[PDB]
Amino acid sequence: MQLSHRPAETGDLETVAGFPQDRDELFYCYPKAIWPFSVAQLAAAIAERRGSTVAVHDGQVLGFANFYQWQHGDFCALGNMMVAPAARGLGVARYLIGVMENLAREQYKARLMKISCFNANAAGLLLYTQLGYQPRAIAERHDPDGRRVALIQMDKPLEP
């Protein structure tokens, strides 16, 4: 469907902060955040990151992403990837990741995009696989209940 993108704005914060539907979803897209998510937590992430971007369809903000890490000439890492629940499965994240890949290439001369995905997040793992990301390593992490989870580190070459 028809999608556009632009930098995130203050008026987008309340909608975007509403995207994660439970503690698990919040952990998957922003593991340092604390449930419940809030506009203050989102604004703080935006201020300390780069490239915060929204995807819009039919006047609705449906998706958000930024760079978790950025290293000129080297790589960027995708951060805070989240989509409105009613709009999932429709290509919003696919679209926005394409946008972020282009931004990494153009703004950071990145050769590689990194994406890390928690093991329980099948939807994420499958999407990133469809976009050409390959798994490289697995790291142990802990969820908010102190349970041990596996963070799967994936990457993809970008090219000029």
> Which residues contribute to the site for ligand 93P (CB under 6 A)?
25, 28-32, 68, 77-83, 88-94, 115-117, 121, 123-124, 126-127, 130, 141, 151
The dihedral sign for the CA sequence 19, 2, 11, 80: positive
Half-sphere exposure of 136 (CA within 13 A, CB side): 13
Residue with Cβ nearer ligand 93P (92 or 110): 92
CB of 9 to ligand 93P, least distance (A): 20
Judge whether 68 and 77 are in contact, CB under 8 Å.
yes
Our CB check for ligand 93P shows the closer of 51 and 79 to be 79
The least CB distance from residue 121 to ligand 93P, in Å, is 5
Three-state SS for 112?
Answer: strand
**Closer CB to ligand 93P, residue 82 or residue 104?**
82
Task: Write out the binding residues for CoA.
Answer: 29, 81, 83, 89, 91, 93-94, 121, 130
For the bound state, the minimum distance from the C-beta of residue 160 to ligand 93P, rounded and expressed in Å, comes to 25
**Numbered residues of the known binding site for Zn(2+):** 5, 57, 140, 142
Beta strand spans in 95-133 (E): 112-118
How far is CA 109 from its chain centroid? 19
Q: Measuring CA to CA, which residue among 119, 48, 38, 49 is closest to residue 77?
A: 49
Closer residue to ligand 93P in complex, CB, 92/99? 92
User: How far is it, in rounded angstroms, from Cα 59 to Cα 79?
Assistant: 24
Question: Smallest distance, Å, CB 93 to ligand 93P?
Answer: 3
